[PDB]
Design a binder for this molecule. Structure first.
Ligand SMILES: *[C@@H]1O[C@H](CO)[C@@H](O)[C@H](O)[C@H]1NC(C)=O
Ligand SMILES: *[C@@H]1O[C@H](CO)[C@@H](O)[C@H](O)[C@H]1NC(C)=O
Ligand SMILES: *[C@@H]1O[C@H](CO)[C@@H](O)[C@H](O)[C@H]1NC(C)=O
Lengths: 107, 116, 230, 103
């Protein structure tokens, strides 16, 4: 259970990529934005071709088996992308998260 | 609990019961460091009331009260001939013992079917 | 006159160890000396077939030409051709079977939906639906088991693999199984077992019963003893 | 701060303990027992054969807590599924837990 909250800055032009651990056994690896009001977790990026409706076409998945870092990148920032993005595995999304971190706008 | 309220000295007792024959050994180790007989004593070995099969002995250790705010777990090590390795180390600290508050928190879910 | 070109289903290549290929003729006249031959893309001939079938009651003939090939040849994408020559048609008709490589392999997701609540009110029948989504390519094998034994295809009907709305090339398929209403209320657990290439084990399954699919009773009798213990 | 006294993963009990640091008073401390059983509520009698009745009883003796209810995430559970495709019957090993183990 890792909690590496980083302060990577963002903007419209700006791009921030998160780093995540991979089991490398070709399971379901996902990044999920937790919703405070909902109390559940909503997958923003998954192993399959699913992408969140708000994040359609502005996100990229980048997997290296060589270096054991699982990383996802966001092309543009609307400044609303401030929340607990947690990575993970297994079919489940909520109860399967491995590491969580909250990104940030401006700085 | 009554002895600890005097804030002077708590005595830990180690009972070796049901062992035959006599001359069973005992040693106290604080954090894995040997404890000399200056700070501990052992009942010279003894006999049982209902069954004459095995005999009993006892050992008591002395300390302070400030020591039982950190514990050091005061392991009691034994040495008897009827043992595999001639060692049956046992230890008890404040963490174990009788607790004063249980809160079971059993949860029921319809999707926690593989206890991750 | 009609001639078919049926590629070998994965349920054949993985199960029968007989990854052959057959081309069937129909809608022709009842005649003989039909020259139905399988060839590779180089023009060379391969092994022939046997046990020519019999005509149909519709006053139309039916015959099949078969060729046995190895699995690695199939996984390479070779263009096999079945050619039919007959007196009816002055030009022999050719049909092509191959494997178009360059398609991703996705693992099917199997969802077992029990019959709806209002369906278990008429007390006539219950339909359990096995839905396989995301699998690519098509031609997946699905069947049903009732208390650990399979059923005939006379009680369950599967659907052809259709494309998916939001997916580029992933598909989906439905398999409905209809059973008597009282055959589902007393228990009698049903299982749907599927077998698509992409599965890591090539075979998976799901299961439903009366106490699992959308239940109306969480009958719990949990007991906890020896709370203090040692 | 809490010692992991039990981390059972087959019945999912997660018993633990700690000492609550109270005020600087005489040692009327409190010892904690945070037992945390999680109920599956949807598993079967045998954990490895989906043909039995589902689950009524949930027995937790904490002395045999150091047949199961749940599935170990790092373990693999499989079965033989009797498929046919015609006349032959290749009884093939299925997966009751896709993703905890791979061929
Ligand atoms: C159990 O009690 C301790 C303190 O008495 C508390 O910190 C803990 O949150 C409790 N457990 C639950 C599940 O609430
Ligand atoms: C509910 O569980 C109890 C406990 O075993 C059982 O006796 C009872 O028959 C169950 N009810 C139903 C409707 O199965
Ligand atoms: C049902 O439980 C039995 C008892 O352990 C065990 O053999 C297995 O988990 C199940 N039986 C079969 C035939 O799979």
């Amino acid at each position: 259970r890792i909690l590496p909250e980083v302060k990577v800055e963002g903007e419209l032009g700006g791009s921030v990529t998160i780093k995540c651990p991979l089991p490398e056994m070709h399971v379901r690896i996902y990044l999920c934005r937790e919703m405070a009001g909902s109390g559940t977790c909503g997958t923003v990026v998954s192993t399959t071709n699913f992408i969140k409706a708000e994040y359609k076409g502005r996100v990229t998945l980048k997997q290296y088996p060589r270096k054991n870092l699982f990383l996802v990148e966001v092309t543009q920032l609307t400044e609303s992308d401030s929340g607990v993005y947690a990575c993970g595995a297994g079919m489940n999304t909520d109860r399967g998260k491995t590491q969580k971190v909250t990104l940030n706008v401006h700085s | 609990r009554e002895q600890l309220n005097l804030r002077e000295s708590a005595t830990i007792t180690c009972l070796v019961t049901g062992f035959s024959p006599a001359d069973v050994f005992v040693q106290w180790m604080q954090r894995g460091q040997p404890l000399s007989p200056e700070k501990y004593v052992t009942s010279a070995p003894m006999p049982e009331p209902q069954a004459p099969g095995r005999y009993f002995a006892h050992s008591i250790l002395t300390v302070s009260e400030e020591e039982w705010n950190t514990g050091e777990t005061y392991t009691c090590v034994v040495a008897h001939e009827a043992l595999p390795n001639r060692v049956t180390e046992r230890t008890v600290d404040k963490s174990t013992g009788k607790p004063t508050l249980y809160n079971v928190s059993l949860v029921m879910s319809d999707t926690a079917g593989t206890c991750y | 006159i009609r001639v078919f070109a049926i590629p070998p289903s994965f349920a054949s290549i993985f199960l029968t160890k007989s990854t052959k290929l057959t081309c069937l003729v129909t809608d022709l006249t009842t005649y003989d000396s039909v020259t139905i031959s399988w060839t590779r893309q180089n023009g060379e001939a391969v092994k022939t077939h046997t046990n020519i079938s019999e005509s149909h009651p519709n006053a139309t003939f039916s015959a099949v030409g078969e060729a046995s090939i190895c699995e690695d040849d199939w996984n390479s994408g070779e263009r096999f051709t079945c050619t039919v020559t007959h007196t009816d048609l002055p030009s022999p008709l050719k049909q092509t079977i191959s494997r178009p490589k360059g398609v991703a392999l996705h693992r099917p997701d199997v969802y077992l939906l029990p019959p709806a609540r209002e369906q278990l009110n008429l007390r006539e029948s219950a339909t359990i639906t096995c839905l396989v989504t995301g699998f690519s390519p098509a031609d997946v094998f699905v069947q049903w088991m009732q208390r650990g034994q399979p059923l005939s295809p006379e009680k369950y009907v599967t659907s052809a693999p259709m494309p998916e709305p939001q997916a580029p090339g992933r598909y989906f398929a439905h398999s409905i199984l209809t059973v008597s209403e009282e055959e589902w209320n007393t228990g009698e657990t049903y299982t749907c077992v599927v077998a698509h290439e992409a599965l890591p084990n090539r075979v998976t399954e799901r299961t439903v019963d009366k106490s699992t699919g959308k239940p109306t009773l969480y009958n719990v009798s949990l007991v906890m003893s020896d709370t203090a213990g040692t | 701060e809490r010692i992991v006294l039990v981390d059972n993963k087959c019945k999912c009990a997660r018993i633990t303990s700690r000492i609550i640091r109270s005020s600087e008073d005489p040692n009327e401390d409190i010892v904690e027992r945070n037992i945390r059983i999680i109920v599956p509520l949807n598993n079967r009698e045998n954990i490895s054969d989906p043909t039995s009745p589902l689950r009524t009883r949930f027995v937790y003796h904490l002395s045999d807590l150091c047949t199961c209810y749940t599935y170990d995430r790092n373990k693999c559970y499989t079965a033989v599924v009797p498929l046919v495709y015609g006349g032959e019957t290749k009884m093939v090993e299925t997966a009751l837990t896709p993703d905890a183990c791979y061929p």
